[model samples]
Every structure is written in structure tokens, then in C-alpha cells.
Target: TTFVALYDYESRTETDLSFKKGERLQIVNNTEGDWWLAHSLTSGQTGYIPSNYVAPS
Candidate 1:
């Protein structure tokens, strides 16, 4: 499924995915509870994103 960032989040670590508000994200994996693996088409980057920062769209 597809998702979009609801808030701007900066990565605190290298594993976290930094994203801007309204950025579209490909939901890679959402089984980790607080974090979801996301793929960014805009930047061609893939990393973990905060679950609260994104939603199904």
C-alpha cells in the first residue's frame, strides 16, 4: 500500500528516514510498531520512518 508523510521528521540517527510533510512514501514494512520501513520515490532513499509521521493515502 501507499502512504504519505503527515509531518516533517528529521533523522536522529543514520537508520531513520528523514522526510518532509506531504512527502509520499512507499510502505515497505509496518510490523515494527513504532517505526515503519519506508521507501522514498522522490529521493530514492529507503529507511525506517516514524509510524505517527505517515498514513495510508
Candidate 2:
């Protein structure tokens, strides 16, 4: 089933890094470059993502 998930754009790779649907993320901190790295609880992984991808909940 399709659901809401955050998307992270890799500028170097020019691809999108996405969290699994229904996944919860832990925000350790946000960076000054208008992006942040977050950990996906469902996937048990972390990656860099643009700030725009972060949806307020």
C-alpha cells in the first residue's frame, strides 16, 4: 500500500532516498545547509535529506 513517507534528494547522485511508508524517524539534529540527516525506525538506517522533504506533523 502507498503511504506518506519522506524523500531525500542526493545532490551528488541525483537520486532520491526515501523512507519506508509508515516509518518513524528520529531527529538527532538539523544542519545549517538547509538539510538534515535522519534515522528511519522501520528501515533502521540513516541518510541525508533536504529540508524541503521534511513534512511538519
Q: All candidates' TM-scores? A: 0.49, 0.36
lDDT of 2 by residue, 1-57 (tens): 333546543345645345565565654454533667888778999987677667766
Model 1's alpha-carbon lDDT is 0.83
Best by lDDT: 1
lDDT of each: 0.83, 0.61
The reply for model 1, stretches above 4 Å from the true place, is 30-57
Q: Deviation in angstroms for 17 in model 1?
A: 0.3
User: Model 1 shows how many backbone clashes?
Assistant: 0
* Residue 49 shift from truth in candidate 1, angstroms: 14
Q: After superposition, how far is residue 37 of candidate 2 from its true place, in Å?
A: 1.3
**lDDT (Cα, tens digit) per residue for candidate 1, span 4-31:** 8999999998776999999999866555
